[PDB]
Design an enzyme around this catalytic site. Sequence first.
Site, PDB file in Angstrom:
ATOM      1  N   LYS A 311       0.834  -1.048  -0.035  1.00 52.94           N
ATOM      2  CA  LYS A 311      -0.010  -0.055  -0.005  1.00 52.94           C
ATOM      3  C   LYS A 311       0.909   1.249  -0.074  1.00 52.94           C
ATOM      4  O   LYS A 311       1.300   1.521   0.990  1.00 52.94           O
ATOM      5  CB  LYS A 311      -0.919  -0.138   1.290  1.00 52.94           C
ATOM      6  CG  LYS A 311      -2.182   1.267   0.904  1.00 52.94           C
ATOM      7  CD  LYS A 311      -2.967   1.144   2.387  1.00 52.94           C
ATOM      8  CE  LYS A 311      -3.990   2.107   2.274  1.00 52.94           C
ATOM      9  NZ  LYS A 311      -3.577   3.514   2.004  1.00 52.94           N
ATOM     10  N   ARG A 316      -3.874   8.598  -5.528  1.00 47.88           N
ATOM     11  CA  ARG A 316      -4.488   7.881  -6.547  1.00 47.88           C
ATOM     12  C   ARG A 316      -4.311   8.721  -7.753  1.00 47.88           C
ATOM     13  O   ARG A 316      -4.768   9.893  -8.013  1.00 47.88           O
ATOM     14  CB  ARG A 316      -5.873   7.243  -6.158  1.00 47.88           C
ATOM     15  CG  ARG A 316      -6.302   6.020  -6.810  1.00 47.88           C
ATOM     16  CD  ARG A 316      -7.714   5.547  -6.174  1.00 47.88           C
ATOM     17  NE  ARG A 316      -7.835   4.067  -6.673  1.00 47.88           N
ATOM     18  CZ  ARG A 316      -8.450   3.325  -6.193  1.00 47.88           C
ATOM     19  NH1 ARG A 316      -9.156   3.679  -4.853  1.00 47.88           N
ATOM     20  NH2 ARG A 316      -8.836   2.157  -6.731  1.00 47.88           N
ATOM     21  N   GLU A 364      -1.012   4.508  -8.338  1.00 49.51           N
ATOM     22  CA  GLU A 364      -0.564   5.530  -7.074  1.00 49.51           C
ATOM     23  C   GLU A 364       0.406   6.056  -7.580  1.00 49.51           C
ATOM     24  O   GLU A 364       1.552   5.629  -8.087  1.00 49.51           O
ATOM     25  CB  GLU A 364      -0.510   4.646  -5.915  1.00 49.51           C
ATOM     26  CG  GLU A 364      -0.324   5.325  -4.693  1.00 49.51           C
ATOM     27  CD  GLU A 364      -1.565   5.829  -4.149  1.00 49.51           C
ATOM     28  OE1 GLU A 364      -2.700   5.673  -4.730  1.00 49.51           O
ATOM     29  OE2 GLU A 364      -1.512   6.412  -2.989  1.00 49.51           O
ATOM     30  N   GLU A 463       2.672   2.085   3.664  1.00 52.80           N
ATOM     31  CA  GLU A 463       1.784   2.188   4.832  1.00 52.80           C
ATOM     32  C   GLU A 463       1.335   0.766   5.354  1.00 52.80           C
ATOM     33  O   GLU A 463       0.857   0.657   6.460  1.00 52.80           O
ATOM     34  CB  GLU A 463       0.465   2.954   4.385  1.00 52.80           C
ATOM     35  CG  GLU A 463       0.806   4.393   4.098  1.00 52.80           C
ATOM     36  CD  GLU A 463      -0.668   5.159   3.629  1.00 52.80           C
ATOM     37  OE1 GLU A 463      -1.728   4.389   3.539  1.00 52.80           O
ATOM     38  OE2 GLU A 463      -0.751   6.243   3.460  1.00 52.80           O
ATOM     39  N   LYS A 468      -6.557  -8.383  -1.796  1.00 54.64           N
ATOM     40  CA  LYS A 468      -7.599  -8.591  -2.686  1.00 54.64           C
ATOM     41  C   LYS A 468      -7.901  -9.920  -3.192  1.00 54.64           C
ATOM     42  O   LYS A 468      -6.896 -10.506  -3.709  1.00 54.64           O
ATOM     43  CB  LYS A 468      -7.210  -7.665  -3.856  1.00 54.64           C
ATOM     44  CG  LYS A 468      -6.776  -6.158  -3.799  1.00 54.64           C
ATOM     45  CD  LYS A 468      -6.165  -5.390  -5.044  1.00 54.64           C
ATOM     46  CE  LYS A 468      -5.713  -4.144  -4.478  1.00 54.64           C
ATOM     47  NZ  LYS A 468      -5.075  -3.368  -5.772  1.00 54.64           N
ATOM     48  N   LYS A 487      -7.395  -3.090   3.330  1.00 52.75           N
ATOM     49  CA  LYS A 487      -6.125  -2.561   3.604  1.00 52.75           C
ATOM     50  C   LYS A 487      -5.919  -2.718   5.130  1.00 52.75           C
ATOM     51  O   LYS A 487      -6.375  -2.707   6.075  1.00 52.75           O
ATOM     52  CB  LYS A 487      -6.480  -0.954   3.579  1.00 52.75           C
ATOM     53  CG  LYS A 487      -7.441  -0.274   4.479  1.00 52.75           C
ATOM     54  CD  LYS A 487      -7.505   1.123   4.354  1.00 52.75           C
ATOM     55  CE  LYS A 487      -8.896   1.839   5.209  1.00 52.75           C
ATOM     56  NZ  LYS A 487      -9.045   3.113   4.870  1.00 52.75           N
TER      57      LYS A 487
HETATM   58  O1  LIG Z   1      -6.383   4.434   3.382  1.00 51.34           O
HETATM   59  P1  LIG Z   1      -7.305   4.448   2.073  1.00 51.34           P
HETATM   60  O2  LIG Z   1      -8.769   3.529   2.239  1.00 51.34           O
HETATM   61  O3  LIG Z   1      -7.409   5.473   1.542  1.00 51.34           O
HETATM   62  O4  LIG Z   1      -6.603   3.286   1.211  1.00 51.34           O
HETATM   63  C1  LIG Z   1      -6.840   3.272  -0.111  1.00 51.34           C
HETATM   64  C2  LIG Z   1      -5.973   3.671  -1.040  1.00 51.34           C
HETATM   65  O5  LIG Z   1      -4.676   3.133  -1.070  1.00 51.34           O
HETATM   66  C3  LIG Z   1      -4.102   3.715  -2.179  1.00 51.34           C
HETATM   67  N1  LIG Z   1      -3.127   2.448  -2.717  1.00 51.34           N
HETATM   68  C4  LIG Z   1      -1.680   2.708  -2.615  1.00 51.34           C
HETATM   69  N2  LIG Z   1      -1.428   1.307  -3.206  1.00 51.34           N
HETATM   70  C5  LIG Z   1      -2.252   0.481  -3.592  1.00 51.34           C
HETATM   71  C6  LIG Z   1      -2.605  -0.890  -4.084  1.00 51.34           C
HETATM   72  N3  LIG Z   1      -1.353  -1.396  -4.397  1.00 51.34           N
HETATM   73  N4  LIG Z   1      -3.837  -1.123  -4.450  1.00 51.34           N
HETATM   74  C7  LIG Z   1      -4.755  -0.292  -3.886  1.00 51.34           C
HETATM   75  N5  LIG Z   1      -4.819   1.033  -3.463  1.00 51.34           N
HETATM   76  C8  LIG Z   1      -3.459   1.394  -3.181  1.00 51.34           C
HETATM   77  C9  LIG Z   1      -4.982   4.165  -3.225  1.00 51.34           C
HETATM   78  O6  LIG Z   1      -4.819   5.524  -3.492  1.00 51.34           O
HETATM   79  C10 LIG Z   1      -6.259   3.857  -2.445  1.00 51.34           C
HETATM   80  O7  LIG Z   1      -7.243   4.587  -2.845  1.00 51.34           O
END
Ligand SMILES: *OP(=O)(O)OC[C@H]1O[C@@H](n2cnc3c(N)ncnc32)[C@H](O)[C@@H]1O
EC number: 6.5.1.1
Length: 644
Positions: A311, A316, A364, A463, A468, A487
């Site tokens: 993560k 995004r 990301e 983080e 998934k 997450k």
């Molecule tokens: O904390 P949150 O619910 O906003 O987290 C979701 C967001 O995390 C970011 N992110 C980063 N890396 C990934 C991967 N590998 N897959 C999915 N999301 C990821 C995104 O910005 C997401 O909205």
Amino acid sequence: SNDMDPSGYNPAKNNYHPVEDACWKPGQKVPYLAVARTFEKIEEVSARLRMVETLSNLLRSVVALSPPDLLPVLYLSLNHLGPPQQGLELGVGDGVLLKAVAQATGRQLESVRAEAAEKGDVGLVAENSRSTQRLMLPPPPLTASGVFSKFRDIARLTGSASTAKKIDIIKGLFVACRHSEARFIARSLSGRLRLGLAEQSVLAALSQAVSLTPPGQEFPPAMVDAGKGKTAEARKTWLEEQGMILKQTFCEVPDLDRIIPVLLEHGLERLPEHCKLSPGIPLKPMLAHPTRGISEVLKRFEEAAFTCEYKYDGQRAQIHALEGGEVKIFSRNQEDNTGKYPDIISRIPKIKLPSVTSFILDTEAVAWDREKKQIQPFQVLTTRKRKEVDASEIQVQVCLYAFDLIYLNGESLVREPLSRRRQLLRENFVETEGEFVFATSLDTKDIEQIAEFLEQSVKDSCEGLMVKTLDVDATYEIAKRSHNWLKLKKDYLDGVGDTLDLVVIGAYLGRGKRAGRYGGFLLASYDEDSEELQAICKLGTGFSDEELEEHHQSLKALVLPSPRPYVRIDGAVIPDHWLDPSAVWEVKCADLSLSPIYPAARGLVDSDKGISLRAPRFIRVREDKQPEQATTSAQVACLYRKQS
DNA sequence: GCTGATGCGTC
DNA sequence: GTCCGACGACGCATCAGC
Ligand SMILES: *OP(=O)(O)OC[C@H]1O[C@@H](n2cnc3c(N)ncnc32)[C@H](O)[C@@H]1O
Ligand SMILES: [Cl-]
Ligand code: NA
């Protein structure tokens, strides 16, 4: 004719008839008081199904009597100015609004501010306050489309002296307000309608309305309640099916300016044939559910094979490549970020094979140090300009970490399982270190491998993990489930993360659901060298309603007229109530950050800036501690160094 | 022309 | 689980006041 005064409009009545129970006539503009009365009936109830019913009644009357007003009525219900990608902004917050209220009533701005803070709602101030705008011509009643048009007029005002021009429009609205209109005009401008009803319930009401009262009929509509011929069971099933048609269409084309015209001309059943996912129009992104540990992941993903992915701590980026060559980039909230990433636009030719003609990527954007070839913190990423014409003046480079492919070569992949979408991502796109790479991933159900993979993600500047499913319920259909991913952040787990004991030195009056209460608090660390308390952050989440009412009653006894001489807040928002330092609370956060306002630990890391907390939340009261046992500023600096 | 308050979007 | 609205830090962009 139907001469009902809108002040008596009741869209929550039993056996609501769209024509006869409306407070306006066929071909008449929907009165804004009709919308306000609907808002009142919605805020009076707590069950969403009751709110949806009430709104649907209003919408059925709009469809039957004034179809051109459906779009503004919907936007007013959502408190939006238009499609998010258009980037319309009121430029009006509580500051400008309260100034408008003051002028419209001759009161001093500070008196208006104080009253709004006490009542926790600017609408109640605009409602109760007495106008001083003596006009010699009674203004006509406000209309829904007229108020919406005035809101967009406010948004278009730009440049020096524009604030006064915005206030003139706002004052023009208030002087024409009747009954409850002023309350919701002010709330809309404040951004706090307090309805309890938002996007999902507005869509449910819309699908129900156009299903029960089909648009496009000759007036008077022969079909005004298409559910009358069905059993209750068949009605429910039919409405849920129709609701899903609208939901899945909207999640792929979240643009009412596009859906409503089609909806009014062709009906809901034929909506998918005229509105579908296309590059250049942002779509709702898949979101994630917080999970408190690896064991909870397995329990949620029993049997279903899943993948773990880093993560990344960035922003995004939904990257659209249209058939023709044009590239557009959208944020998680469907905002247009294209002008923000000229370096990504010039990078697209490198990331795809010659056979790729169009696509929608889910990535990301992460700040990237090309000299060290290392991820940089999210804070560095936020220093990029919002619009950059020249990629040669960019100072913070970014690396795209791609993790999903939603559209490819003219075909939607929304119904494909992640296993297939990920395979198409790997097969058709090309990696370049530090520019465009696939998210680091692990396919396993071994608990020890996951915990180890989780530990490495943190060491690799992330983080935590995203989890998934690959094949079971692994599609990209947001209407079926928006939070299909899990997450797993470090600071979610028990005993892990930064935990601080901080002194409560101030309280802020609550708004909305917190009205009549304290909505937030000002916290401080203990600077042992100077024997002073230094504000470190505010706190406004993590306590139950019961805990928050006890804090209100107990802290009330500590309210001071003026701050203590040994309490330093510097640039922090002055609390509505200063508090005698006494209460010590345990607080958890995700990270520590160098603050532009908070003095906590200033000089221990940087000469000018102190330290604050990222995503702080309340854990519990430390009744066993006094302010002198709170986390020290020196400890805050140590935590920050250990972090970086 | 400069600075700090306001707005809004990112997390 | 969904949906909603309370609340956080901090950055750029904008604009009023100086
Ligand atoms: O904390 P949150 O619910 O906003 O987290 C979701 C967001 O995390 C970011 N992110 C980063 N890396 C990934 C991967 N590998 N897959 C999915 N999301 C990821 C995104 O910005 C997401 O909205
Ligand atoms: Cl305790
Ligand atoms: Na944005």
